[PDB]
């Protein structure tokens, strides 16, 4: 295809209240991050970029990351910034996913890949609010690269400065994993 769509999985966030990397927690016969990547690999992306942080070497030693462009750093301004540097020139935008959200359906990724490109920004509307995955056109890469402060991406996708479109998705906004209680909730799904 003359144009491409790139998937970006952000997984650089730390695991301060766990005592072990959240990316490598067991989930469904694989890891939390592994399951997320497995889902992304079914979506039909032309390129898949993964960002990692302190846990990079441990993740690299535990997980096979062939087919994925891995970017290491020391809403996630720096991580997203350095992911953008790897985006293929023929990509017309990115689909943004979080590494600790393995419950996103491959169908949802296929849907946003399908209708997203006709929008500047697209978010998913679940029963209980707005969530990932997000789509961002190349026309906002510059703004993404200049994100700062707390909740920069979230602020952007709720900003009236761009025509943010919505994809209807069943179920609830994907669960994050920062605590063990979060992890139990995940396991019970």
UniProtKB/TrEMBL annotation:
Modification type Cysteine sulfenic acid (-SOH): residues: 172
Pfam family, one: NTP_transf_3
Gene3D superfamilies assigned: Spore Coat Polysaccharide Biosynthesis Protein SpsA, Chain A
Endpoints of the signal sequence: none
Top-level taxon of origin: Bacteria
PANTHER family in UniProt: MOLYBDENUM COFACTOR CYTIDYLYLTRANSFERASE
The protein's name in its UniProt record: MobA-like NTP transferase domain-containing protein
